[PDB]
Structures are given as C-alpha cells and as structure tokens.
A paper describes a structure:
In this study, we report biochemical and structural properties of [name], a GH5 mannanase from the cellulolytic [name]-E. [name] is a member of the GH5 subfamily 8. [name] is a three-domain protein that consists of a GH5 catalytic domain (residues 63–308), a fibronectin type-III domain (Fn3, residues 362–437), and a CBM2 (residues 459–559) that are connected by two short linkers (residues 309–361 and residues 438–458). In [name], these eight residues correspond to Arg100, His136, Asn177, Glu178, His244, Tyr246, Glu273, and Trp303, with Glu178 and Glu273 serving as the catalytic acid/base and nucleophile, respectively. The conservation of active site residues and the distances between the catalytic acid and base suggests that [name] hydrolyzes glycosidic bonds with retention of the anomeric configuration through a double displacement mechanism.
Additionally, we report the atomic resolution (1.06 Å) crystal structure of the GH5 domain of [name], which revealed a unique arrangement of two loops adjacent to the active site channel. Crystal of His-tagged [name]_34kDa belonged to the P21212 space group and contained one monomer per asymmetric unit. The [name]_32kDa structure has a His tag from a symmetry related monomer bound in the active site channel. Thus, the presence of the bound His tag is not likely to have a significant impact on the position of L1 and L2 in the [name]_34KDa structure. The [name]_34kDa and TfManA structures differ substantially in lengths and positions of two loops, L1 and L2, that form part of the active site channel. Interestingly, Tyr281 from [name]_34kDa is positioned at the tip of L1, where it could interact with a bound mannan chain sugar, but also provide steric exclusion to the placement of an α-1, 6 linkaged glucomannan unit into the +1 and perhaps the +2 subsites. Furthermore, L2 loop (residues 302–315) in the [name]_34kDa is two residues shorter and shifted toward the −3 site as compared to L2 loop of TfManA. Furthermore, L1 and L2 do not make contacts with each other in [name]_34kDa, but instead provide an opening between the two loops that is perpendicular to the main path of the channel and above the catalytic residues. The space between L1 and L2 is large enough to allow a branching sugar to bind in the −1 position.
Numbering used by the authors: 35 to 348
Amino acid sequence: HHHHHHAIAENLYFQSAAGLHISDGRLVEGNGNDFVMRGINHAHTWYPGETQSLADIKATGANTVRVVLSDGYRWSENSPEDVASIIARCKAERLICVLEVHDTTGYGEDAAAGTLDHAADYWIGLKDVLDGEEDYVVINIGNEPWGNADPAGWTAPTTAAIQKLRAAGFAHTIMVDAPNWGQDWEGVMRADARSVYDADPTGNLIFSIHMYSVYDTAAKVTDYLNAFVDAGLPLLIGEFGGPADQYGDPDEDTMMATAEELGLGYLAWSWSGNTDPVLDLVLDFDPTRLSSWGERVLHGPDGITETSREATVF
Ligand SMILES: [Cl-]
Ligand SMILES: [Cl-]
Ligand SMILES: [Mg+2]
Ligand SMILES: [Mg+2]
Ligand SMILES: [Mg+2]
Ligand SMILES: [Mg+2]
Ligand SMILES: [Mg+2]
C-alpha cells in the first residue's frame, strides 16, 4: 500500500549563497551541472534603444550574453534600475548574464580609463540588485583593465578588487580580464593566475582571455588554452574576433574548435554597433542582415547554433 501521506514542503532551512561556482577548474551550476558558455557580447551601454538584442541573441541558440555597462568613469553610468531590468530580461529569455564595466579598458595607457577599484565601488552600489541572482549573473569586474604599459601592474589591483568584492559580501562567480587590452601578450595573467585565484576565498573566480590578432596561429591559441586547463584553472574566451585587422588575422577556427574540445566557454564580439562593423554579427541590429562574421559564428563549425546548450537552471 502507498503511505498515502499529504505533506507540504517548507524550503530548505540552509542553502548556499553561491549559485554558479567553480569545481575542479570548471564552471558548474548550483545543481552540479557543467556549464559551457556559448554566447555573444552586446554593447548595451552605448545602445540603450537596442534591448531587443537580448531576445535576438537567445534566438541564435546562445546560452549567455555579456552585457557592456558603464560605471560612469568614462561613459554614462548604468543605473541600478537599468541593470535590474537587464538581469530580469536575461532570466526571462533563459540567458545567463555576464555583466561587465567597460570603463577600465586600457588603463595605464589610455588616460580616460578608470580603475578596477572604481569599478568595484560601482558593483557594490549594485549589491541590492545583484544579491540573490548568483544562479543567473556573473560579475566581470572590468573589461581589459590594463593597456600595454607595464602590464605587470595588473596583478595587485586585480587581486585587491576581487578581495574588495568578497569583503562586501558578493557570492557570485567573478570573472577577471587580462592586461595588454585583454590579450595578455606579455603573459602576466597566464603567469599570475594561480596567485590571483588563491586570493579568492570562495574559489569562484574565472579568468577571461580576449583573443584578437595576437592569436593568429593554431599553436598560439592551443598553447594558451591548454596552459590554464593543465594548471587546473578556469578559463573562458570572453571576447574573440576573427576577420583580419591591421595587426594580423585572429585564428577563429582554432579558437572555436579548441573551445569545443576542451569544453571552454566563448563569447563572440559583438552583436552590432561597432564603430567598424567588421565585427558586427548583424548589421544595424537586424537579424535579417547577418554579416560574414555572423554567418561564421552562428552557423559555422563549432558555432553557436551547433554547440550551445541552455543553462539547466532554467
Ligand atoms: Cl540606441
Ligand atoms: Cl606560432
Ligand atoms: Mg497515495
Ligand atoms: Mg541555490
Ligand atoms: Mg527589455
Ligand atoms: Mg611577472
Ligand atoms: Mg581570422
């Protein structure tokens, strides 16, 4: 006979603050399932009238969007209301959301660039919007937060910013970008990553490489990605390009193939709106105007539509 009981469930007395987290060098959801980001960057802070981009990005099959914010150091600060709206729209569309402060880009070289400390203060100002969204939102402290001048200087302020966010009570997975405009040409992030990782007492830290023309051969791509995997350190390709520019030709084929082989995340740059539209996946924010680059990223080998799996939390 069935026990025939009729109970109702109270929610667990104790639950973890962390949602998305790191386990054994990989990104995992709260339920333990491995998560491999396959997504797109959207320049929200510069295109407030293009928020339909989030739903259009989901329609590609993408499982993640990286949303460009400003902390007001250089561009126009994204308000807590705006950020709350974006997070909720991403959740409604079943997208994981990587938020990033762009104003740090090129610090130490570009005189208009802000500090990681200023970015951290901005994140702390968003705490009431962000707390409770640890299953859904990854905090990328500052985009490409050092230029090419003295990239060794990146390690101390990166470490300090992580510690400042943890001391403020953040339980999200935190993502950090490399010096040399995100491409880590001098290898400072690659060398110092373990030290930086060990400085996050939660272990919930992921490194992000941006692969442009420095990564113009197969060997350069595979060496970098394998370096992190072999060291047991979590990594994604948080931006990448592909079409040749004045500095070389990024090897997008090897990036995407190796990301698939190793199960590392990637986020293509970008949906639309670049000053030079060569990296626009769609022209004029219009899904019916895919560019050559859009065709490659969405529909080509190891691309988004082929490989992206929705986060299981949804
Ligand atoms: Cl706009
Ligand atoms: Cl080479
Ligand atoms: Mg029964
Ligand atoms: Mg939970
Ligand atoms: Mg909306
Ligand atoms: Mg060094
Ligand atoms: Mg290329």
